[PDB]
Amino acid sequence: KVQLQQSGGGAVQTGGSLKLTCLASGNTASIRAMGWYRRAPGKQREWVASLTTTGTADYGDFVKGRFTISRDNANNAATLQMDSLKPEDTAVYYCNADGRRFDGARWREYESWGQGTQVTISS
Numbered sequence: 001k002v003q004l005q006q007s008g009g010g011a012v013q014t015g016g017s018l019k020l021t022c023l024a025s026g027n028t029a030s031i032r033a034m035g036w037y038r039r040a041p042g043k044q045r046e047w048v049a050s051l052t053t054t055g056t057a058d059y060g061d062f063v064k065g066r067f068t069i070s071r072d073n074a075n076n077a078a079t080l081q082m083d084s085l086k087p088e089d090t091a092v093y094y095c096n097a098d099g100r101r102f103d104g105a106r107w108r109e110y111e112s113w114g115q116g117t118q119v120t121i122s123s
Contacts (some may be wrong), residue, residue: 002026006095006114014123019078022095030099034078038091083123092116
């Protein structure tokens with residue numbers, strides 16, 4: 001169907017920047033939105049950012065203008081540019097894709113996930 005591969009993890013000092021990349025393969029025409037989630041230490045996964053196919057970007061409350069999500073048709077990729085990082089941003093970040101696919105009988109909503117990219121930010 002739709003597969004995702006993630007890269008761009010690292011460890012940086014407070015104030016630094018990182019970029020996450022997510023490459024989609026397979027039925028990428030079916031993708032309605034790509035997004036980023038994260039799991040901070042000992043917490044549950046939380047929503048970070050989404051970008052719909054028509055170009056509407058939304059961000060979690062903790063983002064505060066510091067991260068930028070973009071999508072590239074040429075590479076069927078989504079990216080998260082992360083600036084002004086803080087220890088609180090330490091987490092495993094997961095790429096996701098939402099869309100609708102035809103299973104041969106009905107249209108079905110799907111969600112695909114990457115395997116997660118480690119991010120560490122220390123004071």
